[PDB]
mmCIF file with all atom_site columns, C-alpha atoms and ligand atoms in Angstrom:
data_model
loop_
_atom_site.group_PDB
_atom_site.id
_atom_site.type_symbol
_atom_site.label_atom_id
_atom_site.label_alt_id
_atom_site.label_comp_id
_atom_site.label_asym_id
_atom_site.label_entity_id
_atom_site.label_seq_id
_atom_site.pdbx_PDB_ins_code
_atom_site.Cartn_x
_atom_site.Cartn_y
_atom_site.Cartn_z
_atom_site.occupancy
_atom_site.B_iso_or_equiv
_atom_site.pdbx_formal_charge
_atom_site.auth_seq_id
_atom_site.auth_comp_id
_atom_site.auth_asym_id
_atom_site.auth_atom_id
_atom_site.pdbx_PDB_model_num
ATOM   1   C CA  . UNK A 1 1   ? 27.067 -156.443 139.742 1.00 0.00 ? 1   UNK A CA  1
ATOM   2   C CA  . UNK A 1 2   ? 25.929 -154.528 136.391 1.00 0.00 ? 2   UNK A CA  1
ATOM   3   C CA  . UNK A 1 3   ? 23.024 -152.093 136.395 1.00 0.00 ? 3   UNK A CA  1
ATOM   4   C CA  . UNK A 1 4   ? 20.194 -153.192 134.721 1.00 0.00 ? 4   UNK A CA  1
ATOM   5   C CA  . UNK A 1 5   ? 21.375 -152.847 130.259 1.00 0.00 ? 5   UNK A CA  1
ATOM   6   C CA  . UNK A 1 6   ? 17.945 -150.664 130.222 1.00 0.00 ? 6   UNK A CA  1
ATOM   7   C CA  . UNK A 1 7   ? 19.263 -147.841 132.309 1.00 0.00 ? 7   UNK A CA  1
ATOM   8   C CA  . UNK A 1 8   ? 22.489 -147.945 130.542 1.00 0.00 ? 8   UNK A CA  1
ATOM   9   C CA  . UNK A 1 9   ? 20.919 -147.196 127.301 1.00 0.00 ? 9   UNK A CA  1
ATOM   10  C CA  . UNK A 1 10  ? 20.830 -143.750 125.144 1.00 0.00 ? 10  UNK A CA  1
ATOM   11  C CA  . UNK A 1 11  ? 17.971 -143.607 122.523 1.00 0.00 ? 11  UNK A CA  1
ATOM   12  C CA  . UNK A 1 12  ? 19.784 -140.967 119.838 1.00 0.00 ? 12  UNK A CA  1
ATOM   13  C CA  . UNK A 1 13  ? 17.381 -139.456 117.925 1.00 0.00 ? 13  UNK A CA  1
ATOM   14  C CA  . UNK A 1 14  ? 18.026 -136.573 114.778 1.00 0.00 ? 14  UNK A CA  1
ATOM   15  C CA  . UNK A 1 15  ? 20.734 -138.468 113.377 1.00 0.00 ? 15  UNK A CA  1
ATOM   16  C CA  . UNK A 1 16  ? 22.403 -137.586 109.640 1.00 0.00 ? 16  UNK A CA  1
ATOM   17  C CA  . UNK A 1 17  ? 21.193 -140.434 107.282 1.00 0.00 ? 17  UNK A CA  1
ATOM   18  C CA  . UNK A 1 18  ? 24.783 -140.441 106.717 1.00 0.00 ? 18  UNK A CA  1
ATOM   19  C CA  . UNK A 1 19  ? 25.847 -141.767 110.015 1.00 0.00 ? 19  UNK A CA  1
ATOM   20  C CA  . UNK A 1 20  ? 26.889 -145.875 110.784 1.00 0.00 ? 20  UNK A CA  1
ATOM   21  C CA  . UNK A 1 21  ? 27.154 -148.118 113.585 1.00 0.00 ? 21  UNK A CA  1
ATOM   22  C CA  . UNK A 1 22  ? 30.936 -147.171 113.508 1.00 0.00 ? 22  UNK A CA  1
ATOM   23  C CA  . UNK A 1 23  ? 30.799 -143.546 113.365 1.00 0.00 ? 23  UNK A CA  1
ATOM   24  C CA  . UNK A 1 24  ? 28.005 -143.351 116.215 1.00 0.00 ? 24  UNK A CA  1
ATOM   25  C CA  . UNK A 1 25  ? 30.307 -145.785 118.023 1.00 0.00 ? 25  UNK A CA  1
ATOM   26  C CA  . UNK A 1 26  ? 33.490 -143.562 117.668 1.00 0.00 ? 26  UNK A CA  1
ATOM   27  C CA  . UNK A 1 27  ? 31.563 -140.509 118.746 1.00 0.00 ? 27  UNK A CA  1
ATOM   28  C CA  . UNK A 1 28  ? 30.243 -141.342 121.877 1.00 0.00 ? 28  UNK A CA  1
ATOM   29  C CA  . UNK A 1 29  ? 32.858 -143.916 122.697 1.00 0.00 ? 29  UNK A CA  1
ATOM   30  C CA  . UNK A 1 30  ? 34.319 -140.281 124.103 1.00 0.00 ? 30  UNK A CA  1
ATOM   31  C CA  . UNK A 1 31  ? 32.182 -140.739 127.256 1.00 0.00 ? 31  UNK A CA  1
ATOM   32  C CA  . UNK A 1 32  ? 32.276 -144.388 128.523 1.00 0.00 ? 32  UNK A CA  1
ATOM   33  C CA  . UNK A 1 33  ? 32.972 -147.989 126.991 1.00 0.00 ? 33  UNK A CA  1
ATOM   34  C CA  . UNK A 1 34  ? 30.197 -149.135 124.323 1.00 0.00 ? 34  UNK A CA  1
ATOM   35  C CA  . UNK A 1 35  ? 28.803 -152.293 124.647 1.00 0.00 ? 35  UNK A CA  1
ATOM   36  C CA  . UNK A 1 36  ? 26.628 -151.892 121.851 1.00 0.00 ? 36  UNK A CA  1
ATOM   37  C CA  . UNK A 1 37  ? 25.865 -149.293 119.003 1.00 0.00 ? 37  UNK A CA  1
ATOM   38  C CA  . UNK A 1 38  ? 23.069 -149.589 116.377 1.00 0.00 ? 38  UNK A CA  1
ATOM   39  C CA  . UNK A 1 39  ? 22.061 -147.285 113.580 1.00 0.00 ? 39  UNK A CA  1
ATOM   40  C CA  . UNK A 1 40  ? 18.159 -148.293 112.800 1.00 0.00 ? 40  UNK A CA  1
ATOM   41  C CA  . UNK A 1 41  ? 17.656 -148.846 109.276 1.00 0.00 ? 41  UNK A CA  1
ATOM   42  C CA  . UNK A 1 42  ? 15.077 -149.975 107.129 1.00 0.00 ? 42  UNK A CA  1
ATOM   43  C CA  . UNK A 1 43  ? 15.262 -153.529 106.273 1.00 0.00 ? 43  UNK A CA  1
ATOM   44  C CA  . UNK A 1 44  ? 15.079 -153.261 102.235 1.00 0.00 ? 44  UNK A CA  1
ATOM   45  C CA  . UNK A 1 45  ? 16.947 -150.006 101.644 1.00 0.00 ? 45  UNK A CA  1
ATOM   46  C CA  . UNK A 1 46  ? 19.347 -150.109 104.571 1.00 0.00 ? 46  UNK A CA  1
ATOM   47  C CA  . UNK A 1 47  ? 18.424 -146.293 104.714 1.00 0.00 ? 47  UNK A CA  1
ATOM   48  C CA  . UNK A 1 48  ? 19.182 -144.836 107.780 1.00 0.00 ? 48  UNK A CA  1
ATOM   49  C CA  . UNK A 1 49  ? 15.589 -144.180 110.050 1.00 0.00 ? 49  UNK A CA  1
ATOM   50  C CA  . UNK A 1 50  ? 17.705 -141.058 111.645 1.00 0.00 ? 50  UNK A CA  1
ATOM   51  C CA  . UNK A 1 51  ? 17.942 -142.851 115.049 1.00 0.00 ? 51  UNK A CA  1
ATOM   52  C CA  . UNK A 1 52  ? 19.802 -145.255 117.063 1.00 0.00 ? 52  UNK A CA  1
ATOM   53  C CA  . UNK A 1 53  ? 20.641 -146.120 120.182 1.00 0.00 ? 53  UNK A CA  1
ATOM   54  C CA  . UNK A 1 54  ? 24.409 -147.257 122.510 1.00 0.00 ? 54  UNK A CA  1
ATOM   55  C CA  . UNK A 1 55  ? 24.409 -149.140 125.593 1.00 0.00 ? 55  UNK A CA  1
ATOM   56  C CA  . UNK A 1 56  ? 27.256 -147.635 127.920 1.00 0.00 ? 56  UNK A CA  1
ATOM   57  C CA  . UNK A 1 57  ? 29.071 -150.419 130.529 1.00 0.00 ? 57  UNK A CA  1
ATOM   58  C CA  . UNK A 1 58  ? 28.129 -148.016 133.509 1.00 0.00 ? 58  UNK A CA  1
ATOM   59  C CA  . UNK A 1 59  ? 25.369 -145.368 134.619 1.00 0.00 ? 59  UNK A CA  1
ATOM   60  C CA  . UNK A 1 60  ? 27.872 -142.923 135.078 1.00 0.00 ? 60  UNK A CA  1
ATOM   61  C CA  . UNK A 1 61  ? 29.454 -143.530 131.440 1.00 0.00 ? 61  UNK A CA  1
ATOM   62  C CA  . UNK A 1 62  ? 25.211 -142.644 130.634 1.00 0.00 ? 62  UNK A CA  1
ATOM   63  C CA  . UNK A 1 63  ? 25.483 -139.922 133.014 1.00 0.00 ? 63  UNK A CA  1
ATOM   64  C CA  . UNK A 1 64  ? 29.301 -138.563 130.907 1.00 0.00 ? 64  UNK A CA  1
ATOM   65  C CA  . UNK A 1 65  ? 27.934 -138.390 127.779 1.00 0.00 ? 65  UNK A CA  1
ATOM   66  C CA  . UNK A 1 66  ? 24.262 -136.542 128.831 1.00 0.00 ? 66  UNK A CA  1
ATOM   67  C CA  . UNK A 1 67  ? 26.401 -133.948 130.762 1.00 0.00 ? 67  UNK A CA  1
ATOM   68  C CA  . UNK A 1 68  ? 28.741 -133.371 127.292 1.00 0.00 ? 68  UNK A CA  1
ATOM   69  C CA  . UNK A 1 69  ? 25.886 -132.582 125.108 1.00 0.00 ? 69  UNK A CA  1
ATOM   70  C CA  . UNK A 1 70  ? 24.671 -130.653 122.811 1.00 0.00 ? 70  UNK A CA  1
ATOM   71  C CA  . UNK A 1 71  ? 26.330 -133.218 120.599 1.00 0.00 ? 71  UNK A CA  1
ATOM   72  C CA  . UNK A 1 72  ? 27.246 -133.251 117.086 1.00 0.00 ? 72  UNK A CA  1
ATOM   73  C CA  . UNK A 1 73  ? 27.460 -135.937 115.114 1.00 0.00 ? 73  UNK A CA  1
ATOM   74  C CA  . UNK A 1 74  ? 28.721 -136.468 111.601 1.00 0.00 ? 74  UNK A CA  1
ATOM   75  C CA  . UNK A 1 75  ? 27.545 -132.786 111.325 1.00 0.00 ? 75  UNK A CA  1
ATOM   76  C CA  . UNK A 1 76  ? 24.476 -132.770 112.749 1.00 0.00 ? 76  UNK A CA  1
ATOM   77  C CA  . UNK A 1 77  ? 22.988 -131.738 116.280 1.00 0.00 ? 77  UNK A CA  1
ATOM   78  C CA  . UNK A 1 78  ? 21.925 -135.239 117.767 1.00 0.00 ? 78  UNK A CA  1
ATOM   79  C CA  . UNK A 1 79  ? 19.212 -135.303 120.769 1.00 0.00 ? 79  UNK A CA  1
ATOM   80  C CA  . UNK A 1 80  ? 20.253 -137.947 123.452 1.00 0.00 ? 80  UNK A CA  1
ATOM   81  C CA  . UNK A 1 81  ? 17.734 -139.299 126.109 1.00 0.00 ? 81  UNK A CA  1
ATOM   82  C CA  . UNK A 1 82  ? 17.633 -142.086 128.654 1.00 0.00 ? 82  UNK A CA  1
ATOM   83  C CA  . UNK A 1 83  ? 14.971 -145.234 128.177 1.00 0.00 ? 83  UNK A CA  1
ATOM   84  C CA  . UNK A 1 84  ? 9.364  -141.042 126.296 1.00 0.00 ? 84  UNK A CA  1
ATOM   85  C CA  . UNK A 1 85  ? 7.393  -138.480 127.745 1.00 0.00 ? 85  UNK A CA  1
ATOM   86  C CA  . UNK A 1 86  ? 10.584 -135.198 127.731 1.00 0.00 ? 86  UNK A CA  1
ATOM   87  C CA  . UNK A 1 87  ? 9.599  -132.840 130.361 1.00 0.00 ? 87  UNK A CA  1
ATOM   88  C CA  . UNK A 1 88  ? 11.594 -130.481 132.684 1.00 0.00 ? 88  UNK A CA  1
ATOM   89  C CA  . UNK A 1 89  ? 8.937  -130.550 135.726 1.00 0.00 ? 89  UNK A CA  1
ATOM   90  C CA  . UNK A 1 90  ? 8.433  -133.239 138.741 1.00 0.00 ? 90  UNK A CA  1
ATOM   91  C CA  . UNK A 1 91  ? 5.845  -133.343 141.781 1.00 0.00 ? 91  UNK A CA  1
ATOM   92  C CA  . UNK A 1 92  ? 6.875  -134.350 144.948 1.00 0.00 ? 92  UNK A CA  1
ATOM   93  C CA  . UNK A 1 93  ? 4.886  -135.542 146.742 1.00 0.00 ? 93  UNK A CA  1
ATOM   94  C CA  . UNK A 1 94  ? 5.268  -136.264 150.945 1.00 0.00 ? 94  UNK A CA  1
ATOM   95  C CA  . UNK A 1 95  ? 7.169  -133.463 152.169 1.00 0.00 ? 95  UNK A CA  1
ATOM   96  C CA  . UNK A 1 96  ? 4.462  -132.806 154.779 1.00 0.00 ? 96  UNK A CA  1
ATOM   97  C CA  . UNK A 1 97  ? 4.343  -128.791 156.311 1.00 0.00 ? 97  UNK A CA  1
ATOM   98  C CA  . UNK A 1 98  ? 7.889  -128.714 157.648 1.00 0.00 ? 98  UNK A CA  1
ATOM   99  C CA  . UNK A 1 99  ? 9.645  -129.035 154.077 1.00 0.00 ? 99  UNK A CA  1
ATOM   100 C CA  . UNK A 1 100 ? 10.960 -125.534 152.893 1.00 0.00 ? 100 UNK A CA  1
ATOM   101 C CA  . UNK A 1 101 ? 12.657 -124.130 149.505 1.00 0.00 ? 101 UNK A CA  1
ATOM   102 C CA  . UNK A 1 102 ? 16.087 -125.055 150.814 1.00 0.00 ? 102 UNK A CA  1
ATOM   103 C CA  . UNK A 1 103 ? 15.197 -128.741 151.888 1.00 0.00 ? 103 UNK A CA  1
ATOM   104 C CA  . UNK A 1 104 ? 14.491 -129.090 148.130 1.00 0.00 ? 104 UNK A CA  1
ATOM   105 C CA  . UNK A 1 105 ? 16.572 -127.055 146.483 1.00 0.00 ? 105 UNK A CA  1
ATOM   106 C CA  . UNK A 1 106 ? 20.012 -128.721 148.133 1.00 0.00 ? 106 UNK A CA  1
ATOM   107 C CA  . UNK A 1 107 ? 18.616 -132.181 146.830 1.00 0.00 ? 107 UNK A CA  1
ATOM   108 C CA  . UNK A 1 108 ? 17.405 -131.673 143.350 1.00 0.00 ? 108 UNK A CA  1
ATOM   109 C CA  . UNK A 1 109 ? 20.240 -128.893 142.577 1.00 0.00 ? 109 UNK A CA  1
ATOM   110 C CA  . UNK A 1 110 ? 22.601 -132.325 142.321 1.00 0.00 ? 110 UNK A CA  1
ATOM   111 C CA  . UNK A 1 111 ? 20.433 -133.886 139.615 1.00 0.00 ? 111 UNK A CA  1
ATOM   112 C CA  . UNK A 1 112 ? 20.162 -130.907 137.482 1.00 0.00 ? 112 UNK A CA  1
ATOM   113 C CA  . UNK A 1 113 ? 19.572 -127.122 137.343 1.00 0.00 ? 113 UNK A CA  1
ATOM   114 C CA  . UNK A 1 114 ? 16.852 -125.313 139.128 1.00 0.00 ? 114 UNK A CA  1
ATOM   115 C CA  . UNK A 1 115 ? 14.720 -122.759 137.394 1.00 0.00 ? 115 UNK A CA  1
ATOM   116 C CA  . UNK A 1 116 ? 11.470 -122.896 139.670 1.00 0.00 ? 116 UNK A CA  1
ATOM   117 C CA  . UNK A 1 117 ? 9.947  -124.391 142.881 1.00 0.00 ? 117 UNK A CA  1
ATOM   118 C CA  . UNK A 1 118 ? 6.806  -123.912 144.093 1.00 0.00 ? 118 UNK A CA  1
ATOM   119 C CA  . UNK A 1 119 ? 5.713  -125.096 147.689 1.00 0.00 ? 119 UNK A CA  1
ATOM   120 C CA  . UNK A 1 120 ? 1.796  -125.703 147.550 1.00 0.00 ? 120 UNK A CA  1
ATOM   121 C CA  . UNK A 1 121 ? 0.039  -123.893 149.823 1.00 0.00 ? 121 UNK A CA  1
ATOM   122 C CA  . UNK A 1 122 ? -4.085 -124.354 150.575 1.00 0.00 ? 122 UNK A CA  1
ATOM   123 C CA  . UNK A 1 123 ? -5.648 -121.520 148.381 1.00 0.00 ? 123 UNK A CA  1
ATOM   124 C CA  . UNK A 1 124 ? -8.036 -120.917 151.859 1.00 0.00 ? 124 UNK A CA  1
ATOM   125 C CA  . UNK A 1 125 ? -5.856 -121.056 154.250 1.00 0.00 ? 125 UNK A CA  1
ATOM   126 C CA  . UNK A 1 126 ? -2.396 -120.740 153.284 1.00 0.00 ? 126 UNK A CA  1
ATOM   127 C CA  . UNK A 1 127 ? -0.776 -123.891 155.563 1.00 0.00 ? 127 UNK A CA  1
ATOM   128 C CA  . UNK A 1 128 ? 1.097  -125.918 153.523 1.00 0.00 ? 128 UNK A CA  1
ATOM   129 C CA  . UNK A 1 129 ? -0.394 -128.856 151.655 1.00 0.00 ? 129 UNK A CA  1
ATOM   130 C CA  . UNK A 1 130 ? 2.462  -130.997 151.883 1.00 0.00 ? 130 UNK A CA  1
ATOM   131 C CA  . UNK A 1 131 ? 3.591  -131.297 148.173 1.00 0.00 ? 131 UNK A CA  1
ATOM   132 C CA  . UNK A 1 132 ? 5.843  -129.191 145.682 1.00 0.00 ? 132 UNK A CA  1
ATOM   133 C CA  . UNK A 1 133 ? 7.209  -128.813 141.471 1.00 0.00 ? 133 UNK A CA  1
ATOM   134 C CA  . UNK A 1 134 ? 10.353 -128.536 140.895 1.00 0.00 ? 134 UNK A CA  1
ATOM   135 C CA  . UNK A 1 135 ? 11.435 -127.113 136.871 1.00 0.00 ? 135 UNK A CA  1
ATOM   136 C CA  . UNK A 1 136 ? 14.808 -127.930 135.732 1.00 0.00 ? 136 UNK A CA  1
ATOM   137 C CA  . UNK A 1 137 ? 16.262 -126.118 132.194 1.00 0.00 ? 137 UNK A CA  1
ATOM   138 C CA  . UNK A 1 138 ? 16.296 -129.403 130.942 1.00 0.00 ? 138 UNK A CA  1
ATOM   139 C CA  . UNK A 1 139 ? 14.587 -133.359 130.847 1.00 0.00 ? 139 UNK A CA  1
ATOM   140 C CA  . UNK A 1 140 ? 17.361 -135.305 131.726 1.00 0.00 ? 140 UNK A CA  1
ATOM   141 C CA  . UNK A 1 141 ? 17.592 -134.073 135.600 1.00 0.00 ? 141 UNK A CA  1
ATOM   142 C CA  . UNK A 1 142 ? 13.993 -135.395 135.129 1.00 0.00 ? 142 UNK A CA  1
ATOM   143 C CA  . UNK A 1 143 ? 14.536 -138.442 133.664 1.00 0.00 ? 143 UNK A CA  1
ATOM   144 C CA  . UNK A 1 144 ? 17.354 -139.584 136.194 1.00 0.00 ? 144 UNK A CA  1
ATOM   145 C CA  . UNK A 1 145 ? 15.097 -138.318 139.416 1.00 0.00 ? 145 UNK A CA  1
ATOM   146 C CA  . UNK A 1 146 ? 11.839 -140.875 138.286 1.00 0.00 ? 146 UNK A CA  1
ATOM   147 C CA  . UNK A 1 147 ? 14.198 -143.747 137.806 1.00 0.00 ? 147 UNK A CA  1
ATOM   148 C CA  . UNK A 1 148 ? 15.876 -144.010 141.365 1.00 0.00 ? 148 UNK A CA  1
ATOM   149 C CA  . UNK A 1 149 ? 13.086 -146.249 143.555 1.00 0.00 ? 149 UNK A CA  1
ATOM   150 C CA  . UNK A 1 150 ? 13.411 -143.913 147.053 1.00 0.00 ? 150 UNK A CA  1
ATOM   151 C CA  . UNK A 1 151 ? 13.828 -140.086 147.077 1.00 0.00 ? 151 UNK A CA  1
ATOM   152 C CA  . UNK A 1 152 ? 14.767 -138.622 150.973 1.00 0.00 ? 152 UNK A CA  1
ATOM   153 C CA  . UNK A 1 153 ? 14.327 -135.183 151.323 1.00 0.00 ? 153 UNK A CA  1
ATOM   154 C CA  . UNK A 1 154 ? 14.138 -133.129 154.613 1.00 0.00 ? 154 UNK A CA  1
ATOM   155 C CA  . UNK A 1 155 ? 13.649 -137.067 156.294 1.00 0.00 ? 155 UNK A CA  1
ATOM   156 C CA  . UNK A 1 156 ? 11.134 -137.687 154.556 1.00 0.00 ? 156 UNK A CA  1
ATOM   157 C CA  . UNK A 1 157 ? 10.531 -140.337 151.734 1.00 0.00 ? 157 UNK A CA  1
ATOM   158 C CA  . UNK A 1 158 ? 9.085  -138.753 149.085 1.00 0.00 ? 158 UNK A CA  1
ATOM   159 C CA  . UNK A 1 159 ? 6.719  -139.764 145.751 1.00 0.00 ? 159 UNK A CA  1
ATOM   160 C CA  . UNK A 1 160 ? 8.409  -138.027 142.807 1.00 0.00 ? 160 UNK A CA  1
ATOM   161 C CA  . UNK A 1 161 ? 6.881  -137.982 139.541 1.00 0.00 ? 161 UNK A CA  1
ATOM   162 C CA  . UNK A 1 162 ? 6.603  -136.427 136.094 1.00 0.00 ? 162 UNK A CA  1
ATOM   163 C CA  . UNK A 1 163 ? 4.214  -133.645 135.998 1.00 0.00 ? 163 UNK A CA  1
ATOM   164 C CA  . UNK A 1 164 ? 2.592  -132.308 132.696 1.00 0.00 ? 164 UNK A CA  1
HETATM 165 C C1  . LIG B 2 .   ? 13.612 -143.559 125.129 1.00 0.00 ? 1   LIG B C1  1
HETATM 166 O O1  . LIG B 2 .   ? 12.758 -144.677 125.354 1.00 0.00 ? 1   LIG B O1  1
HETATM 167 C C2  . LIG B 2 .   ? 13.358 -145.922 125.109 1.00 0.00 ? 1   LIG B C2  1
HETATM 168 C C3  . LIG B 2 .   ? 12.837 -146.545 123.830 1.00 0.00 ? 1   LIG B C3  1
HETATM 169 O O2  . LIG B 2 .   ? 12.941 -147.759 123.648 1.00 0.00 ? 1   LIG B O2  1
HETATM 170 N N1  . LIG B 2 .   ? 12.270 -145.710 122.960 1.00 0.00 ? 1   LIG B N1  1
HETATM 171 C C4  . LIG B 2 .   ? 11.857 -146.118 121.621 1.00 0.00 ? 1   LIG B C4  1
HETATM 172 C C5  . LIG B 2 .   ? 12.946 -146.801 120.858 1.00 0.00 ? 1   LIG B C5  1
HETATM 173 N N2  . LIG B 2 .   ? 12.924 -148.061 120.472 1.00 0.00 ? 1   LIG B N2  1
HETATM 174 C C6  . LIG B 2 .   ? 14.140 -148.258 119.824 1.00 0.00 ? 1   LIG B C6  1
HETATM 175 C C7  . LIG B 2 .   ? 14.658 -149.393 119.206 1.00 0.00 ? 1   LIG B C7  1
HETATM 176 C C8  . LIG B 2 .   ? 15.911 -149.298 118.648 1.00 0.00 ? 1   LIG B C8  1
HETATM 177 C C9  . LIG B 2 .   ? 16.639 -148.110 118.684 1.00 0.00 ? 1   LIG B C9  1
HETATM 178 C C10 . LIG B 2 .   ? 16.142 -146.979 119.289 1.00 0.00 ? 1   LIG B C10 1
HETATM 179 C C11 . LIG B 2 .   ? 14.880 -147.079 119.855 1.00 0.00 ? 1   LIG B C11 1
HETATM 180 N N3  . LIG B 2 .   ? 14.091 -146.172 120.527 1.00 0.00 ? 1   LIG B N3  1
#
């Protein structure tokens, strides 16, 4: 069946006051079928509150439109994000001592791109502590990773989480 409407969802914030339901609709109609399209407005004025939000028939119609951004909408530079706390940096946790750069870096590379990871190691000691970050350029590799329920990595099934 359908995923769940929630994880089909883009909040757009930095709208122009200028744009409407329709011309929010036409724009990211681009990247997936719309099954809904709001501009919020205030309820006497009808001015625009700069943001809005479309609901996409699919996750990878969500996914589409994400991967074709910066977007620009009715003139303006628009910021996109998933259903918010926007960072580029996860813990994993549950890797154990056998888990190694690559074991990470060939899983997360697929959800976005890799700037850092950092294996923790006991300060003492040295021996692995059996947790890691991983930093991506950007929030949405983030934002798709803390969604899915399981994360296997190196056969293990890891916690993954936002971090700072
Ligand atoms: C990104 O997190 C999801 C969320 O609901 N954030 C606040 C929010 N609530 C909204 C209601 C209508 C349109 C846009 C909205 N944005």
């Amino acid at each position: 069946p359908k995923e769940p409407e929630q994880l089909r969802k883009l909040f757009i914030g930095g709208l122009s006051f200028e744009t409407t339901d329709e011309s929010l609709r036409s724009h990211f109609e681009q990247w997936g079928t719309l099954t809904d399209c709001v501009v919020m407005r205030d309820p006497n004025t009808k001015r625009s509150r700069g943001f809005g939000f479309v609901t996409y028939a699919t996750v990878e119609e969500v996914d589409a439109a994400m991967n074709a951004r910066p977007h620009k909408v009715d003139g303006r530079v628009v910021e996109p994000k998933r259903a918010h706390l926007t960072v580029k940096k996860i813990f994993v946790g549950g890797i154990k001592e056998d888990t190694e750069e690559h074991h990470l870096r060939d899983y997360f590379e697929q959800y976005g791109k890799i700037e850092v990871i950092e294996i923790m190691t006991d300060r003492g000691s040295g021996k692995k502590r059996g947790f890691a970050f991983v930093t991506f350029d950007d929030h949405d590799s983030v934002d798709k990773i803390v969604i899915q329920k399981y994360h296997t990595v190196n056969g293990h099934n890891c916690e993954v989480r936002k971090a700072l």
